[PDB]
Subunit: 50 residues, 2 copies
């Protein structure tokens, strides 16, 4: 998965499904922390190279 | 977040919510991908430390 795949991700509507705003809030936290690790990995690859 | 935080997260239910199975399956995929990138980042840091 890429951060773009997480961004604004939606799911099928369901009665008594998980609350939409709480799931969308949580996916903003997941997207942020996944992009933090991917950016660090990019940084460390470049240091390896140099 | 840690990968296990993503598995452990709960959400309240709503009249119009998101399908639980679809959310849980997506978060299982993000957890697995996140734990792999964290491992790769940790390996790279060691390759930079060495």
């Amino acid at each position: 998965l890429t951060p773009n795949d997480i961004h604004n991700k939606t799911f099928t509507k369901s009665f008594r499904g998980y609350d939409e705003d709480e799931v969308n809030e949580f996916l903003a936290q997941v997207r942020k922390d996944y992009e933090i690790v991917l950016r660090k990995k990019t940084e460390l690859e470049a240091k390896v190279n140099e």
